[PDB]
Design a protein around this ligand. Structure first.
Ligand SMILES: *[C@@H]1O[C@H](CO)[C@@H](O[C@@H]2O[C@H](CO)[C@@H](O[C@@H]3O[C@H](CO[C@H]4O[C@H](CO)[C@@H](O)[C@H](O)[C@@H]4O)[C@@H](O)[C@H](O[C@H]4O[C@H](CO)[C@@H](O)[C@H](O)[C@@H]4O)[C@@H]3O)[C@H](O)[C@H]2NC(C)=O)[C@H](O)[C@H]1NC(C)=O
Ligand SMILES: *[C@@H]1O[C@H](CO)[C@@H](O[C@@H]2O[C@H](CO)[C@@H](O)[C@H](O)[C@H]2NC(C)=O)[C@H](O)[C@H]1NC(C)=O
Ligand SMILES: CC(C)CCC[C@@H](C)[C@H]1CC[C@H]2[C@@H]3CC=C4C[C@@H](O)CC[C@]4(C)[C@H]3CC[C@]12C
Ligand SMILES: CC(C)CCC[C@@H](C)[C@H]1CC[C@H]2[C@@H]3CC=C4C[C@@H](O)CC[C@]4(C)[C@H]3CC[C@]12C
Ligand SMILES: *[C@@H]1O[C@H](CO)[C@@H](O)[C@H](O)[C@H]1NC(C)=O
Ligand SMILES: *[C@@H]1O[C@H](CO)[C@@H](O)[C@H](O)[C@H]1NC(C)=O
Ligand SMILES: *[C@@H]1O[C@H](CO)[C@@H](O)[C@H](O)[C@H]1NC(C)=O
Length: 1831
């Protein structure tokens, strides 16, 4: 069986090897598509992010400064890549390195020190004691004061204009110089040098006075003289020493000024990142017109956009409020207390202004400052004070301190400048700048509003002012004195731009990454919502309970474990089949086209005839079409593995999966192919069928409702879902490198089911001659039983013809001869071999040739003949020799390699019948060969048949008469399934033949009675059988031939041929055909309405016809409506959300860090009592919540695996501080989405307790940062391997704790210190000192944290932050209440509900809605441009030799025909138009009761035909292919349908008709939407639905198609009957056909039927009148076509080939009707191929044509044997030298005598009849075919 399959695959591949265009594109398309895919992939490189930790935020509950820093420091969430110390369980503040906090702590230290410092009082009492004992110590540079008992040189000396010394008589040029020198040298130790210098130029007389100053000792030795003041001086030294140590131990103000100087001091001062680095180091560690000007500059400042967006609303925004209930007035009080806690800086400018002169004069002129300066520099101070300062801290120096302590002027500037004066400049400048900046903040942001409508109006009014902060709206009952209803409910209404969208609560589809973009997702921490939430909760708790703050709250994001952004890979691997199988769509279309093409010309059936079963053909198609699929899959695997697209999977498994999918899809192709019967129809519809087969996978990918065995239910029945599921498994296991085995099994089962379905569809869709025993019997059929009984025998070399009526068999008989259907209880001896006993050996030697030619197109003759010889089953040399021998004599040695498609039809038939004889088949059966063949080639095919008749048993079953007679030597006639007669032609004629016929011809002018009487005189048996123009025919019986008068009458007619008016004569033998029959204007309007009456019938009768013209658009608009009713409006941002967990399944965790049970224990208890984890209060408030408080109150640990020893040895080499496990971080070349924990990071299962829809994990002392990162992956990987499409595991928890108490004593001491300070140091009760001191006290009080909780919120959940903040604040309030009856009653809820959108936002959402409705528009335009496809395809249907030309012969005025067609097109278009108007008029989309929708949509839809249908007509003029425009027109309409350019598109689409329709519809829809949204809440504008913008342009563009219709009519104008092909509409009936043609003829309607019912009776067809035309046979169709010409009876008629392979006993009425038409008196014209029609109907005359152009007489004679043949030959050769033996066989021969004179031949044969024993003899003339063969 191998050679059969080999040759079968050979021809299968040669169908494609000879095309060179389909195979090339088939190979190129997948390569090009996947190269484009790879280019797209490489255009999007994967993004990799490290495992990054997030800095913790702060909130006003903690303190103003921490969250101010959080706003300014970390507004980007920079992903520190390592655990921030804030994320540690214990330490939270994260702000040691912040020097601003250091400055504030130093200020607090200074306040607490000055609370208990008495240095100033010591100075005052020292000065008082000095004044009341010494009374004179004002010893400045000029003069020295000393008024006492003169303990140490008590005297005075003044540096004045003259030398004055009150110790003696100074007596003074020299005096002034000495005084000036002393004043210049007035220093601690310069007095002695000045005295020495003076004494150098003076005498010792002034020396004695110089002796007095020596005891002065620069006012140092004097203090030692008084013992009472010594203790006070020592106390002063100690006090100033410790004060200086404290002042120099801050090291913060100096560091900040040093760091701020150099940025604006360099000459270049170029802008760079240095300023940002310095600012960050100041705020964190290493890792009116002026106000507008500064804000604009900050906005334009680089790297400041995010901080500006975070800050601007904070300090410029304003809030709103509710009816001013006194309790809510207290809420204002608390909130604006919290806000004014930051407002300390407003009064610092006033403090500077009020105390600058005082502090200036105090340290410049007061005696206390002078005493301090004097004590700061002394020998005793050098010994004691300097040593104390040096040992206290690393201060600058004692001399350095004395420099900037209390000077009088600038000493030197060139050397070094460091003085108190420059610092005082800089402090003044800094406070001026601070005041200028702080005058930009509107801290008066409390605006009560009573009504909600005015509330919202003022909200938009402030928003348009570019300043709007959040807005709080309570739900108070009445303005009553009762504070709160114990359950607080409010909505924080804030604008859209600053609050996250409230439409969706989750991310939607799962997406890797922490989702922590600083600007795009932090909208709850930079938009300020969460700050308002926390502040309002703190104020409410203060109102209801009384505790001051007792709580701080921090925000911390959930750390994320080193993801990777491979979104493209995931999204493509979720949908690889689409763009991978586009190429396979092309391939399956090609395969189905090939299969239906070979099914068209019935190649499969003929192949089955030659002895092959359908199974081998199916297997060959399988292999030959799988091989290209296999190579395509190999190329795909190569481009995937080497393309860096799907690594981590072996090429072998993907190749195997692709091969399996190819097998399944090829079996699906085989299934879907056998249901179709047209080539291009199948080729076009294969892609649509595959789309319909594939879409359910896309539908089911999202529903995920088919987890169970229903998945197998839709997998076995449907192929692409299983492959998509295997693709899903590949995507899941792609990174970490139901199951694939299940997918493979489902694919195999689906393939088997498809094969079974394909097999089922294929399976369900007297007269007897004496037989000479000398000649061998080749086919001896005896006892044939069929459900008919007959028997017949055939000879080895005898030609045989089989005749009948096509109804009594001859399709069962040849089928029995072949393998179509075995006989029932019968047998047939073929070459002595039984067909039932032998079913193999008989097939290879059985030739056959059916009606349809077997010719593989795109192939030459050599491959056809070689393939057939191979299929017959011979060797190589044998088939080569047979091929050469057949080619030598067939007549194909010229066209050795010519294309069979280029061969003529007659040559094609000759080649087919030649193929029927190749291989030396001993038996061959033909079946009406040479039907549509050239008459010239008839003789060539006859020559081939007579040459191949040497022992071959040729069988003919033809409907032709002449061929069966002249060729066939024995024929059989069968009646009603019974063999009526059989025998040779002459023998059968001998007893059942009609009388001999003789024909005479004329030149009207010849008497007929004269010749009739003359002939009747000689013989009385002559009878006239016919009388037609210029012709005459007489018949004489064979019985009593009367040879005497016979030859005599020939003698007179030869002698008197020219004597009478006759011209010549002829002989026509009794034709076998009759033997076979015997044995077995008002007219214009009438035509216009006639066309419409014609066309209404197609719609009225085609119930099962092309009804998809209505159903399909309706369904395709239904699907568009369903799609539009599901998509989100995009304008429903407002919503009414609560803030519970609001999540399906989750559980949090509580970490009681620092278990010192100070105040944290109470808060923890409040989280685990009867009130519960949420906001419930003895009732279920959240309607999703459904409390269902079921769960044990005792902690239960989850079961543990056998890894307890692993935990035991984790303590070794991994301490308590780290508890990690190694993680598989992505490599440089190797990567994955999870990170795999080899063991279990955070292995010990934390304690569990189920309370309410959650089981909180009581963590304690665990490394939470590591534990969360580990367990998150440890759970997500497990929940993703099964691919449940799982959401995030945990959405957030929180860790408690207590801040370190290393700071200064609590605010209870700071406030008392402030109170003690203010009453001292010139206490004032003004509006500046009191307010500033109170603000400073509040600022100090607002910087402590006795405890602080930290909310570990997961940012993936959009509303997690606010919800968890609300939960913890509820816990805080429940814990703070004292001696309450029950904490379950209380609780707080905080709705989020944004404002209404503004003008720009409303316009944007309207545009988005338009973008969404684009798809609805494209679907509608698809349906409305798809509807005219039916009209156009019917136009081509009637155009292809059916009605166009045929109506063109009839007077129809072609101008009005197209107008009538257009009128019908409009009249039919309304129904789909009305249905598509009604389809969405029941709903409330795109149309309403308003007059702004219906007039502009219904009219547009109705009149769209006016534009679409005229343009379709020119697309059908030159279109020589039927029923394929239905696809190409739809495709081109789709391709058409799918700021200068936008403005010019109005004129660009003005001449166009299709594209503008959808655009204008969208303009109308968007205009209506914009009008409704604007008029809902804004001013009124005139709707423009029917205005000149879109509607008038649409009307003009559509109405411009009248020109297109006129152009189509002009193109049509520019370019009896019966054509060769039948011209009948395939669904109407013949009765209505003749009615239509009669009505077009001109007969009035009152008598059209009487005419039609006449014409049908002229052609019979009583049983086929009012029936379906498509069920008619060829004979009935030809009969109807012939009647179509004779319906009106034109004076001249044209008829073409009346008989085309039609059954007998029916065509006789055809000749009768033709003769009736001829004899009625109307001239006719006829042309055909069969000369029988011409000689039977056509009347130079045929007899005259065959007389001179034709050959001579032809005689046949039979003698009873072989030896008797020689005497006949000798006698006829001697008597007649001119004779030709054309045919000769044993016992019968043919002679051709080219002599016109015939009388002597009859005389010779009659004279000596007895001697040579003549029994049967007859003479005839050459047929009309002979003369045309000669010509
Ligand atoms: C819970 O578990 C997690 C596990 O991830 C712990 O996280 C670790 O935290 C420590 C510090 O808290 C991290 O240590 C840091 O390592 C960085 C890089 O270390 C590599 O490079 C150094 C130098 O070449 C090598 O010696 C070392 O072996 C590594 O190869 C450094 O940037 C850090 O040092 C810098 O910062 C500190 C602090 O500012 C300075 O004092 C240093 O001088 C230096 O400038 C630091 O040492 C560690 O990488 C984190 N991961 C792991 C796996 O250990 C959490 O700490 C733990 N929870 C708690 C509360 O501790
Ligand atoms: C902002 O939007 C809300 C809700 O869409 C409007 O609230 C309306 O209030 C009035 C009177 O109660 C009623 O029309 C409805 O109850 C609410 N909805 C609508 C759609 O009207 C509110 O009027 C809007 N504010 C502005 C200024 O337009
Ligand atoms: C593209 C697919 C979608 C629906 C398909 C049509 C569905 C029904 C018919 C009717 C048939 O008689 C001719 C083909 C025709 C017109 C199809 C052509 C191809 C088609 C337009
Ligand atoms: C886009 C695809 C979808 C169907 C395709 C058409 C299918 C059939 C034909 C008929 C052929 O004779 C010319 C190409 C043509 C017109 C194709 C052009 C490309 C086409 C329109
Ligand atoms: C700051 O440093 C001190 C060490 O003196 C430490 O006790 C304290 O916890 C640190 N605070 C923060 C917030 O890191
Ligand atoms: C809020 O208004 C002003 C501005 O901050 C402030 O002085 C006042 O004290 C605050 N409100 C109350 C009720 O104290
Ligand atoms: C700034 O203060 C210094 C202090 O010595 C002084 O010299 C200078 O004049 C001051 N400048 C102004 C503009 O007041």
């Amino acid at each position: 069986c191998w050679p059969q399959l080999r040759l079968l695959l050979w021809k299968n591949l040669t169908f494609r090897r000879r095309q060179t265009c389909q195979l090339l594109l088939e190979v190129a398309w997948p390569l090009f598509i996947f190269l484009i895919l790879i280019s797209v992939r490489l255009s999007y490189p994967p993004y990799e992010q490290h495992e990054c930790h997030f800095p913790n935020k702060a909130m006003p509950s903690a303190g103003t400064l921490p969250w101010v820093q959080g706003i300014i420091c970390n507004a980007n969430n920079p992903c520190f890549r390592y655990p921030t110390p804030g994320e540690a369980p214990g330490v939270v503040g994260n702000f040691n390195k912040s020097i601003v906090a250091r400055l504030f702590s130093d200020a607090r230290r200074l306040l607490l020190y000055s609370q208990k410092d008495t240095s100033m009082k010591d100075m005052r009492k020292v000065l008082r004691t000095l004044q009341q004992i010494k009374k004179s110590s004002s010893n400045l540079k000029l003069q020295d004061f000393l008024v006492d008992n003169e303990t140490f040189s008590g005297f005075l000396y003044h540096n004045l204009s003259l030398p004055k010394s009150t110790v003696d008589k100074m007596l003074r040029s020299k005096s002034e110089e000495m005084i000036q020198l002393g004043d210049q040298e007035v220093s601690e130790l310069c007095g002695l040098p000045r005295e020495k210098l003076a004494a150098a130029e003076r005498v010792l007389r002034s020396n004695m006075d110089i002796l007095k100053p020596i005891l002065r000792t620069l006012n140092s030795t004097s203090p030692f003289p008084s013992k009472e003041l010594a203790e006070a001086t020592k106390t002063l030294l100690h006090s100033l020493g410790t004060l200086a140590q404290e002042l120099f131990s801050m090291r913060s103000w100096s560091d900040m000024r040093q760091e701020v100087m150099f940025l604006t001091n360099v000459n270049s001062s170029s802008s760079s990142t240095q300023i940002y680095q310095a600012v960050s180091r100041i705020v964190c560690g290493h890792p009116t017109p002026y106000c507008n000007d500064l804000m604009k500059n900050l906005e334009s400042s680089p790297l400041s956009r995010i901080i500006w967006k975070a800050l601007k609303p904070l300090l410029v925004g304003k809030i709103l409020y509710t009816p001013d209930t006194p309790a809510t007035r207290q809420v204002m009080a608390e909130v604006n207390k919290t806000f004014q806690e930051l407002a300390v800086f407003h009064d610092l400018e006033g403090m500077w202004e009020e105390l600058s002169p005082k502090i200036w004069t105090f340290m410049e002129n007061s005696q206390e400052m002078d005493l301090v300066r004097m004590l700061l520099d002394s020998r005793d101070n050098d010994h004691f004070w300097e040593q104390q300062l040096d040992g206290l801290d690393w201060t600058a120096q004692d001399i350095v301190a004395f420099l900037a302590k209390h000077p009088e002027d600038v000493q030197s500037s060139n050397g070094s400048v460091y003085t108190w004066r420059e610092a005082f400049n800089e402090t003044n400048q800094a406070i001026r700048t601070i005041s200028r900046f702080m005058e930009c903040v509107n801290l008066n942001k409390l605006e009560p509003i009573a009504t909600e409508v005015w509330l919202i109006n003022k909200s938009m009014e402030l928003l348009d002012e570019r300043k709007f902060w959040a807005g709080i709206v309570f739900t108070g009952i009445t303005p009553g004195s009762i504070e709160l209803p114990h359950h607080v409910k409010y909505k924080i209404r804030m604008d859209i731009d600053n609050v996250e969208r409230t439409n969706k609560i989750k991310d939607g589809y799962w997406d890797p990454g922490p989702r922590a973009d600083p600007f795009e997702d932090m909208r709850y921490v930079w938009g300020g919502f969460a700050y308002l939430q926390d502040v309002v909760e703190q104020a409410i708790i203060r109102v209801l309970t009384g505790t001051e703050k007792k709580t701080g709250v921090y925000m911390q994001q959930m750390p994320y474990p080193c993801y990777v952004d491979d979104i493209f890979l995931r999204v493509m691997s979720r949908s690889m089949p689409l763009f991978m199988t586009l190429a396979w769509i092309y391939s399956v279309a090609v395969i189905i086209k090939g299969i239906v093409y070979e099914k068209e010309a019935r190649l499969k059936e003929t192949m089955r005839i030659m002895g092959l079963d359908n199974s081998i053909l199916w297997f060959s198609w399988f292999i030959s079409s799988l091989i290209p699929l296999l190579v395509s899959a190999g190329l795909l695997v190569v481009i995937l593995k080497l393309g860096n697209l799907l690594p981590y999977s072996d090429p072998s498994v993907v190749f195997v999966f692709l091969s399996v999918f190819a097998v399944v899809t090829i079996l699906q192709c085989f299934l879907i192919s056998t249901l179709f019967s047209r080539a291009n129809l199948a080729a076009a519809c294969g892609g649509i069928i595959y789309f319909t087969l594939y879409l359910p996978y896309v539908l089911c990918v999202a529903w995920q409702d088919y987890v169970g065995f229903t998945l197998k239910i839709f997998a076995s029945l449907l192929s692409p879902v299983a492959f998509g599921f295997g693709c899903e498994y590949f995507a899941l296991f792609e990174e970490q490198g139901f199951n694939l085995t299940t997918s493979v099994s489902m694919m195999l089962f689906d393939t088997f089911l498809y094969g079974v379905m394909t097999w089922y569809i294929e399976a369900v869709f007297i007269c007897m001659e004496e037989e000479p025993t000398h000649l061998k019997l080749g086919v001896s059929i005896q006892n044939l039983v069929k459900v008919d009984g007959l028997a017949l025998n055939f000879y080895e070399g005898q030609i045989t013809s089989f005749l009948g009526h096509n109804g009594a068999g001859k399709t069962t008989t040849m089928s029995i001869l072949t393998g179509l259907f075995p006989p029932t209880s019968g047998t047939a001896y073929i070459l002595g071999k039984d067909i039932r006993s032998e079913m193999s050996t008989i097939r290879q030697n059985l030739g056959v040739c059916p009606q349809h030619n077997v010719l593989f197109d795109m192939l030459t003759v050599e491959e056809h003949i070689w393939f057939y010889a191979r299929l017959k089953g011979l060797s190589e040399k044998h088939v080569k020799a047979e091929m050469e021998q057949m080619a030598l004599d067939v007549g194909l040695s010229s066209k050795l390699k010519s294309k069979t498609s280029q061969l003529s039809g007659g040559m094609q038939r000759k080649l087919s019948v030649a193929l029927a004889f190749v291989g030396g088949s001993k038996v061959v059966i033909l079946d009406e060969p040479t039907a549509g063949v050239d008459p010239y080639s008839r003789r060539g095919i006859w020559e081939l048949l007579l040459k191949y008749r040497q022992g071959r048993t040729i069988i003919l079953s033809t409907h032709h008469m002449d061929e069966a007679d002249v060729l066939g030597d024995r024929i059989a006639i069968i009646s009603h399934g019974k063999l009526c007669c059989v025998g040779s032609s002459l023998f059968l004629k001998n007893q059942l033949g009609t009388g001999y016929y003789l024909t005479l011809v004329k030149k009207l002018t010849i008497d007929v009675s004269a010749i009739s009487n003359l002939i009747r005189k000689h013989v009385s048996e002559a009878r006239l059988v016919e009388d037609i123009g210029h012709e005459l025919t007489y018949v004489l019986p064979y019985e009593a031939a009367k040879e005497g008068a016979f030859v005599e009458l020939f003698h007179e007619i030869d002698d008197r041929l020219s004597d009478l008016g006759i011209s010549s004569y002829g002989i026509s033998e009794t034709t076998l055909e009759e033997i076979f029959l015997k044995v077995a204007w008002k007219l214009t309007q009438q035509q216009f309405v006639a066309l419409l009456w014609k066309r209404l019938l197609i719609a009225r009768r085609s119930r099962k016809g092309f009804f998809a013209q209505i159903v399909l658009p309706a369904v395709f608009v239904c699907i568009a409506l369903v799609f539009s009713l599901i998509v989100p409006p995009f304008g429903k941002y407002p919503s009414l959300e609560l803030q519970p967990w609001m999540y399906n399944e989750q559980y949090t965790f509580v970490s009681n860090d620092a278990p010192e049970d100070t105040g944290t224990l109470e808060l923890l208890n409040a989280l685990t009592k009867d009130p519960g984890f949420g906001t419930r209060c003895m009732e279920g408030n959240p309607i999703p919540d459904t409390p269902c408080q079921a769960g044990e109150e005792e902690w239960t640990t989850a079961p543990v695996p056998q890894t307890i020893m692993d935990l035991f040895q984790n303590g070794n080499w991994t301490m308590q501080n780290p508890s990690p496990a190694c993680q598989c971080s992505s490599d440089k070349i190797k990567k994955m989405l999870p990170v795999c924990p080899p063991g279990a990071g955070g292995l010990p299962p934390p304690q569990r307790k189920q309370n309410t829809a959650d089981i909180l994990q009581d963590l304690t002392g665990r490394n939470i940062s590591d534990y969360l990162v580990k367990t998150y992956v440890q759970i997500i990987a497990k929940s993703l391997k099964n691919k449940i499409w799982v959401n995030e595991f945990r959405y957030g928890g929180f860790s408690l704790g207590v801040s370190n108490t290393q700071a200064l004593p609590p605010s209870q001491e700071v406030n008392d210190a402030i109170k003690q300070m203010k009453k001292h140091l010139k206490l004032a009760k003004d509006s500046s000192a009191d307010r500033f001191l109170n603000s400073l006290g509040r600022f100090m009080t607002g910087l402590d944290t006795k405890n602080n909780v930290k909310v570990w919120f997961n940012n993936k959940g959009w509303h997690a932050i606010s919800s968890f903040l609300n939960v913890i604040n509820n816990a805080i309030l429940r814990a703070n209440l004292q001696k309450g009856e029950n904490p379950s009653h209380y609780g707080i809820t905080a709705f989020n509900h944004p404002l209404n959108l503004t003008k720009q936002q409303l316009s944007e959402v309207a545009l988005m809605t338009t973008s969404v409705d684009v798809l609805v528009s494209i679907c509608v335009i698809f349906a409305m441009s798809f509807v005219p496809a039916s009209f156009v395809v019917f136009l081509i249907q009637e155009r292809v030799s059916k009605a166009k030309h045929l109506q063109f012969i009839s007077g129809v005025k072609p101008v009005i025909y197209w107008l009538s067609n257009f009128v019908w097109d409009m009249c039919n278009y309304v129904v789909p138009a009305t249905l598509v108007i009604i389809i969405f008029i029941c709903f409330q989309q795109k149309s309403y009761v308003s007059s702004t929708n219906l007039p502009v949509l219904a009219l547009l839809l109705l009149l769209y035909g006016w534009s679409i249908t005229p343009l379709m007509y020119p697309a059908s003029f030159v279109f020589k292919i039927p029923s394929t425009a239905y696809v190409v027109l739809t495709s081109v309409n789709l391709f058409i349908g799918i700021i200068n350019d936008i403005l010019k598109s109005v004129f660009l689409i003005f001449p166009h008709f299709c594209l503008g329709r959808g655009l204008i519809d969208m303009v109308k829809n968007q205009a209506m939407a914009d009008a409704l949204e604007r008029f809902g809440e804004n001013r009124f504008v005139s709707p423009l639905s029917w205005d000149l913008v879109g509607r008038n342009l649409f009307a003009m563009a559509v109405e411009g198609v009248v020109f297109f219709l006129i152009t189509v009519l002009i193109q049509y104008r520019f370019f009896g009957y019966c054509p060769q092909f039948d011209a009948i509409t395939e669904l109407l009936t013949g009765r209505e056909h003749v009615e239509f043609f009669a009505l077009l003829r001109g007969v009035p309607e009152k008598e059209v039927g009487k005419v039609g019912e006449w014409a049908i009776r002229k052609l019979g067809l009583v049983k086929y009148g009012e029936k379906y035309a498509g069920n008619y046979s060829g004979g009935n169709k030809r009969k109807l076509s012939t009647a179509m010409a004779l319906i009106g009876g034109p004076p001249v008629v044209f008829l073409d080939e009346p008989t085309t392979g039609m059954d007998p006993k029916a065509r006789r009425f055809l000749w009768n009707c033709a003769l009736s038409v001829v004899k009625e008196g109307r001239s006719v014209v006829l042309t055909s191929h069969s000369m029988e029609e011409c000689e039977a109907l056509c009347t130079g005359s045929v007899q005259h044509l065959k007389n001179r152009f034709g050959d001579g007489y032809t005689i046949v004679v039979r003698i009873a044997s072989n030896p008797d043949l020689k005497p006949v030959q000798d006698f006829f050769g001697l008597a007649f030298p001119g004779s030709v033996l054309k045919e000769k066989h044993r016992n019968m021969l043919q002679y051709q005598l080219p002599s016109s004179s015939l009388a002597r031949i009859f005389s010779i044969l009659s004279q000596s009849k007895k001697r040579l024993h003549i029994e049967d003899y007859s003479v005839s003339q050459t047929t009309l075919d002979q003369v045309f063969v000669n010509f």
